[PDB]
Amino acid sequence: LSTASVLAFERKLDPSDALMSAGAWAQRDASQEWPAVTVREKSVRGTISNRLKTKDRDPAKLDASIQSPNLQTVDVANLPSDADTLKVRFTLRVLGGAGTPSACNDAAYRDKLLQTVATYVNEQGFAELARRYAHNLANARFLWRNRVGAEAVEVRINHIRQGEVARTWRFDALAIGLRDFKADAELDALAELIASGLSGSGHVLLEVVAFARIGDGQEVFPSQELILDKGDKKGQKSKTLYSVRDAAAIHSQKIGNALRTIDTWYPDEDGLGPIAVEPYGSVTSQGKAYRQPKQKLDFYTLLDNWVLRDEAPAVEQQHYVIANLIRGGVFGE
Amino acid sequence: LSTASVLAFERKLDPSDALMSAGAWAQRDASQEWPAVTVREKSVRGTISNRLKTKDRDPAKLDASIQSPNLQTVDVANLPSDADTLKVRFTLRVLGGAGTPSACNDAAYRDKLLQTVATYVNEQGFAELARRYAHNLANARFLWRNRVGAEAVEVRINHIRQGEVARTWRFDALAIGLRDFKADAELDALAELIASGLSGSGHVLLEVVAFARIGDGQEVFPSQELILDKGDKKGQKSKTLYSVRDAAAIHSQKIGNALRTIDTWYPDEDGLGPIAVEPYGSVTSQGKAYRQPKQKLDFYTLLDNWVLRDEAPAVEQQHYVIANLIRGGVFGE
Amino acid sequence: QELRQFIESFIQERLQGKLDKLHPDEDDKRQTLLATHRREAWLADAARRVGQLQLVTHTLKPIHPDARGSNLHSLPQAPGQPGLAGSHELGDRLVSDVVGNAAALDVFKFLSLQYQGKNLLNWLTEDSAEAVQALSDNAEQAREWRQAFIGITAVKGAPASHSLAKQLYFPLPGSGYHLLAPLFPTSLVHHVHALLREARFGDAAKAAREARSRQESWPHGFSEYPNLAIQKFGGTKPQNISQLNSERYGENWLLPSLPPHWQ
Amino acid sequence: SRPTVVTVTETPRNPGSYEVNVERDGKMVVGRARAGSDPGAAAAKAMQMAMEWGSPNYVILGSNKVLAFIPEQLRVK
Amino acid sequence: SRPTVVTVTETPRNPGSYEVNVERDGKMVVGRARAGSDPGAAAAKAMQMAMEWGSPNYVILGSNKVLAFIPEQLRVK
Amino acid sequence: VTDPEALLLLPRLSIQNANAISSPLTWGFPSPGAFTGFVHALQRRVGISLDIELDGVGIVCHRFEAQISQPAGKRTKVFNLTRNPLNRDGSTAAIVEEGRAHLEVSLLLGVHGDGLDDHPAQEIARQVQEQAGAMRLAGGSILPWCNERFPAPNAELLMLGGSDEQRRKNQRRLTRRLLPGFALVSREALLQQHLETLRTTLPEATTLDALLDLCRINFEPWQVRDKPGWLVPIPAGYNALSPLYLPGEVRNARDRETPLRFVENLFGLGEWLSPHRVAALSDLLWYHHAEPDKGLYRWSTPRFV
DNA sequence: AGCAGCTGCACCTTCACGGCGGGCTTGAT
């Protein structure tokens, strides 16, 4: 009847921080003694290229301020002058036990949710969601700005069972698109492994390595940190990059957002591409929230109409509901 | 409609650090085993030659005028005593996809902006902008002080297709000038490829070499650092030069500014020469900012008249606005 | 009667501050402000505005800025075990907070006027001359407005929590568990840190600066406190959290407790 | 206060190269002299500046890659 | 400082040429002597200045091109 | 109450985004309450089927890194945040600050149950390690040790089994496995003795704890009075505020079959030791102490000194 | 025509608030 007041779901598909190293192409097989890329700090001189605030001031100050230079000091990460290949490496743990919540108040809602997830996994198992996750692992979507000028990307995936590699996949990330999910032979085996891990049987451990071919001495883009308080003028930095163990890296939540853009079922203009699975599915780069609560297609009204009133939606929205359960989150009323 | 609160743009025309080597002329075909130009440090014994203050009229300060050498410490770079060629090498990467902003906050302003850049590309291509970019690559404008007394300059351009050369351009950088854009048969074949990469239908990664004949053992001028600290005396150097792993170099923003001098239209006398592409058209070393906000000939007013009110400016101002979009930056409310 | 003129000047300073802040001279907006402020309709509005709670030991809004729950004003008992101790229960008597709607926060500024006791004016239950000295027209409005004033300080409410709060488990020695909902203690060691960093650092600091070789040394000192960390709760409007969070803007000023590096 | 202070930092504008600062009598006697492109050359330049500008006594500070080439006995005097 | 310290530095006013300093019980016995114009002669001069003046023990410092001519068991004693 | 019959040694674990802010007055290393909750979760998942009771954890912390930055011209530090998704209608969300950290830590844990027999000697520790890999320690996931140079196995070291010379050999062979680290212990008697010392005709309780952490570079000649080792304040449990409510009365509880009670933080003192200057490895274990009728839910290292 | 539900708007507090440094922990094969 009435829903719960505490309802939390833990996160499956847990990645690590993707670390960067530099090397040469055609030595991509012995790619373990490669040195890492390091962040440097350069001080630059430029102009005043921002809009003026012409209120409550004098114009002569602005005319002085535009005819004067502007000194800053930012961070930058490059490749060395004799290495054209960027290697991005991380791991992945698929846990399994998807529909079981980590917190639930009402026992009746818990039993009805368990029966709904059991009916879903009996009728339609994790065959579409794991296929889309394997597609997003296949094309190197986890290299965000390291993929716009890349000449060729190559993704190598290793399944680890006890202490050694049990199965090896290799994909060309440029032939596999970013906006259509086709069918293949090895991708279906990887999807079946991810599905067998998501169904509580195993906790699959994968190792993902990506090789991107940029060019000698060009720029690589690590993650940037959100710093709200840069102290005072004449000494501030205004750009800081992320690195672990003195090696430039990418945040784990960025990789997690990268392998999560599977939702193509949002109502208006679904041909623009997949977006990430979010309640009231929103993009920060767009400033727009698709799946508004006005048209009944968000997560909460769909879950309440599926569980409480048994008004089951279309299968393309049941996939979105179960993907939101796989992602995790905190909901309560 | 109104302007977005956050609005950012990417960077096309990405250069790298320009490295210096030193060797002989007429060995320009085997110029890959040349030793670098190592930055050197020395001490001088000058005289006091700054203008004296109003407090400086006393006897204890005209004694500084009479007998006081300065004893300063400075960096200096030099060719060897049997070498007359400075070779400067870097790599360029032209990406394309200019109009699409990297981040925004409006759905309506993004649609109007993309419609405006789209109808600009429908009316005319990037032929003027790619023409002036390849022209500024043709004469070796990235050699700033290394070009005012040189005997000959020669620029070689290689299109790296798949780790290897696919096309070669050879120029004469002193025949083509700095005050006029012309036409030829090789510059047009380069500008076609640059516009093809700039539109998005290709993959343009170039390798640029330039030879400058100075003289045996004379002074070359690498980039000077910007130490953003507090001033002091007798314990500072006040001249530090740039070097990449014991090899003299020039910063990437210097090489980027050099091949971005395409702006020959402004409200002042356009017969002087081209200035850089910046909002409010500023050249800070001269101490004058053209395209002032007193007149309606800057980037922001022309942009907000083109986008919101659909008041289009002249075609030259449209070329300037699209060059400002190709450069990048932060243009928002 | 006695202190009526003080609160009259208080409402007049509020009115003149509002007139200098808005400065609208169209359609008699200043007359529409003087219609409310110069009469005692402001006192009726200050009696109307309910939502303050006077809670110090429990403030839920640091855990999440929109977390509606129960807030408490109750100090624990002293523990029995030696060593550890918290919540400053020995001495240096405490200052209380105010949690509620920000739009009525100025009402607390009406109750904290330092004329014959600011905290005494905030809870004027003991006094009897001020209770009839507040108004001049009747007696029913006096008792009603006094009951509204002493009511919005201490109210109980209902025991509740939130899904965005914290709720843990604790193993018992026999079997079973407890649910252990923690809260945020509004303690002011911020003032101790400000005193030890900026009040008397100067004189003893210059005494240690320019009198090392000399025997002239003051009977005082200082403290450096390395590796502090600032934490902010309200983003740019800290008054939505509480009132003591407005006194100090963010600046939780967390103390370092980090493990040594081997080499 | 009493000894000279020799500091060996790594220049962050290019990783792998080092600089040395010598401070005597509370003022900077030598600033930003370059000290090679490996930690061994930085240790050699640090010990040279300690010998020459050392006077009675000195202390050597700096990076941990640099001080791995100097024994712990030879870092103070 | 008890043992002898031999430091080989490179002259930044003329790159490629080296110089050697010897410490020898807290007062320098060799100051900025001319070592070779290449890492091999600098290594030979450093080992000569360690053979003399290093009677109980010594420590040799220098660059990685210089110390690549001496085995790792002969630099410290 | 309990003394472990055997120790289990998990090798060097890695945690990527733990919790930095541990208490309303401290930041840095996480609270030991997280480790005690972790070993109780391991007990609830594995210890029922194998007839073993897992209790007590020694914390090592081989290395620790925090994601902080220092603003320009200030000696204070700030935290690096994340970017949460938008609320709705394109509006950015209000920031709630939280700190993160990277840990490399191994922990030894004492098992005392009679469910260890002659045939299960090494598969018990392997079955514990295979389950402690798909879990988290302080809100940060445990890094899984993919294809690398050489792995690291567990150990099941029996305490009473063996001669006394062999007992010291087993203690040395266990101490050699975790020597480049440290160990966190609780020093409450030292804090009480410093309270008795500092109280000289003036009343104070908690500025005692502030005194043992700052740098007293002030003295009449200047002099710096030192302290024994790394002394750090830690959150050592909670203290009750409200009476205990019955399991179905608190609105919006976590579960409706547990009594609920409003608590607040307590603060104690601790020290970071080296694991070779203790000579006792049945020590350094952390336990809970509840006293369920008066609050004061505490955890400590008993039998230490 | 009369309650439930959603969206827009007014209300409110407070000046950054110092730098010549400052500590205590590190094994044995």
What order do the helices and strands come in, and which of them pair?
The structure is cut from a larger assembly and holds 2 copies of chain A (333 residues), 1 copy of chain C (263 residues), 2 copies of chain D (77 residues) and 1 copy of chain F (305 residues).
Chain C: H1 4-22, H2 29-37, H3 41-48, H4 105-111, H5 118-122, H6 129-133, H7 140-151, E1 170-171, E2 177-178, E3 181-182, H8 190-199, H9 201-210, H10 244-247, E4 255-257
Antiparallel strand pairs in C: 1-2
Helix pairs in contact in C: 1-2, 3-7
Chain D: E1 4-10, E2 18-24, E3 27-34, H1 39-53, E4 58-62
Parallel strand pairs in D: 1-4
Antiparallel strand pairs in D: 1-2, 2-3
Chain F: E1 6-9, E2 13-19, E3 26-28, H1 32-47, E4 54-59, E5 63-66, E6 68-69, E7 78-79, E8 100-105, E9 107-111, H2 123-131, E10 155-158, H3 164-175, E11 183-186, H4 189-198, H5 207-211, E12 231-234, E13 238-240, E14 262-265, E15 268-273, E16 287-289, E17 298-300
Antiparallel strand pairs in F: 1-9, 1-10, 2-8, 4-9, 5-8, 6-7, 11-15, 12-15, 13-14, 16-17
The structure holds one DNA strand of 29 nucleotides.
Pfam families (chain F): Cas_Csy2 (PF09614)
Structural features, described:
This is part of a larger assembly, with 2 copies of chain A (333 residues), 1 copy of chain C (263 residues), 2 copies of chain D (77 residues) and 1 copy of chain F (305 residues). Chain A has 7 helices and 16 strands. Chain A has helices at residues 59-66, 107-123, 129-138, 186-198, 252-258, 299-307, 315-327; strands at residues 7-9, 14-15, 18-23, 39-46, 70-77, 85-94, 103-104, 153-160, 165-172, 204-213, 249-250, 261-263, 275-276, 282-283, 288-289, 329-331. The longest helix of chain A is centred in the middle third of the chain and has 17 residues, at 107-123. In chain C, helix 3 (41-48) packs across helix 7 (140-151). Chain C contains 10 helices and 4 strands; from the N terminus they run αααααααβββαααβ. Chain C has 263 residues and is mostly helical. Chain C has helices at 4-22, 29-37, 41-48, 105-111, 118-122, 129-133, 140-151, 190-199, 201-210, 244-247; strands spanning 170-171, 177-178, 181-182, 255-257. Chain D has one helix spanning 39-53; strands at 4-10, 18-24, 27-34, 58-62. The radius of gyration of chain D is 12 Å and the shape is globular. In chain D, strand 1 and strand 2 form a beta hairpin. Chain F has 305 residues and is an alpha+beta fold. Chain F has 2 domains: 4-181, no CATH class; 182-301, no CATH class. Chain F is 17% helix and 23% strand. Chain F has helices at residues 32-47, 123-131, 164-175, 189-198, 207-211; strands at residues 6-9, 13-19, 26-28, 54-59, 63-66, 68-69, 78-79, 100-105, 107-111, 155-158, 183-186, 231-234, 238-240, 262-265, 268-273, 287-289, 298-300. Chain F has a 4-stranded antiparallel sheet with strand order 4-9-1-10, covered by helices on one side. A 3-stranded antiparallel sheet of chain F has the order 2-8-5, with no helix packed on it. In chain F, strands 11-15-12 form a 3-stranded antiparallel sheet, with no helix packed on it. Classes of the chains: A alpha+beta (333), C mainly alpha (263), D alpha+beta (77), F alpha+beta (305). At the C-F interface, strand 1, strand 2, strand 3 and strand 4 of C face strand 3, strand 5, strand 7, helix 4 and helix 5 of F. Chain C binds one DNA strand of 29 nucleotides through helix 4, helix 8 and helix 9. Chain F: It holds the Pfam family Cas_Csy2.
